[PDB]
Amino acid sequence: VHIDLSALNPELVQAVQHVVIGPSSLIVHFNEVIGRGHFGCVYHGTLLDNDGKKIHCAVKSLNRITDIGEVSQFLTEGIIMKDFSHPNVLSLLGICLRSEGSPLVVLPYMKHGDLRNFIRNETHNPTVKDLIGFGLQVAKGMKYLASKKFVHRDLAARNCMLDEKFTVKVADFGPVKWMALESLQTQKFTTKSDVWSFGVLLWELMTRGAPPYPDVNTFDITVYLLQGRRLLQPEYCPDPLYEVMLKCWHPKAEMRPSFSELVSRISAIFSTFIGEHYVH
Ligand SMILES: COc1cc2nccc(Oc3ccc(NC(=O)c4c(C)n(C)n(-c5ccccc5)c4=O)cc3F)c2cc1OC
């Protein structure tokens, strides 16, 4: 991969400079990988500040970026994300623009990986409170994103990260069994469609990572929803939380709760529960 960085626009390169990091602070370990490939080609990295203080990070290689249009899109994506600062939204540590090799994305290392795999792992013992807690953290990261007027487009348990402190980090912003009714038939995406996906995400949490709609095909989902059928209440899901889920799957997007309202409602439910193995 050889990208001509001189073909990039002067004004956009200037705008991206505050997001750029390079070999004077970042060591990429190209011989050691992270994960199975859902998040792409990801390597271990180490970022150092001016005094030599080391930070563990994940370095993603954008191997499909070939032309200057794609690099330009990538830059702006980096600009947008670098502004974001919330405990429940994954940080962008920086990006690398290189003359040789694919563009790179630098994120803080997430010890416990993604949320779906954490909750499916039978050696972990989250309580009902723990799972509600994880859902509450997702809602707050989504509340911040919605306040910044950003549409996620791919919200699901698999796309939320878990750090060493068990802080949930919403990620992969910027999957038909997760899509709102209106997204499936009009291809439109809004904060309200993110709300539907959050409902499915909550359902995944209470089932500890069960696959949604196991007995309906991906092409039969639209009609299933139009017949007024919904995901069944999980064994460990309390009735008030199941109500929240059903409200998230309202056929009319505008009647769905906002993330502000969801944080409020889930916060109330969460406090009624006792017993937690993973404290954030
Ligand atoms: C221990 O196991 C793991 C630890 C892990 N630790 C950290 C990160 C991990 O994975 C990733 C998670 C998220 C992303 N990226 C995003 O969320 C991105 C967003 C929102 N934007 C906007 N961009 C973007 C796109 C263009 C330009 C600028 C940023 C992104 O790259 C990348 C990853 F590699 C891990 C995966 C692990 O196992 C799989």
Curated annotation (Swiss-Prot):
Processing after translation: Dephosphorylated by PTPN1 and PTPN2. Ubiquitinated. Ubiquitination by CBL regulates MET endocytosis, resulting in decreasing plasma membrane receptor abundance, and in endosomal degradation and/or recycling of internalized receptors.
Outcome following mutation: V42I: In RCCP; constitutive autophosphorylation
Impact noted for substituting H44L: In RCCP; constitutive autophosphorylation; causes malignant transformation in cell lines
Effect noted on mutating M179T: In RCCP; somatic mutation
Region described as Interaction with MUC20: spans on this chain: 249-280
Interaction with RANBP9: annotated span: 162-280
Effect of V138L: In RCCP; germline mutation
Family: Belongs to the protein kinase superfamily. Tyr protein kinase family.
Subunit record text: Heterodimer made of an alpha chain (50 kDa) and a beta chain (145 kDa) which are disulfide linked. Binds PLXNB1. Interacts when phosphorylated with downstream effectors including STAT3, PIK3R1, SRC, PCLG1, GRB2 and GAB1. Interacts with SPSB1, SPSB2 and SPSB4. Interacts with INPP5D/SHIP1. Interacts with RANBP9 and RANBP10, as well as SPSB1, SPSB2, SPSB3 and SPSB4. SPSB1 binding occurs in the presence and in the absence of HGF, however HGF treatment has a positive effect on this interaction. (Microbial infection) Interacts via extracytoplasmic residues 25-656 with L.monocytogenes InlB; MET can bind HGF, its endogenous ligand, and InlB simultaneously. InlB probably dimerizes upon binding to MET, which encourages subsequent dimerization of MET.
Protein name, UniProt field: Hepatocyte growth factor receptor
Species for this entry: Homo sapiens
Residues of the full protein shown: 1051 to 1351 of 1390
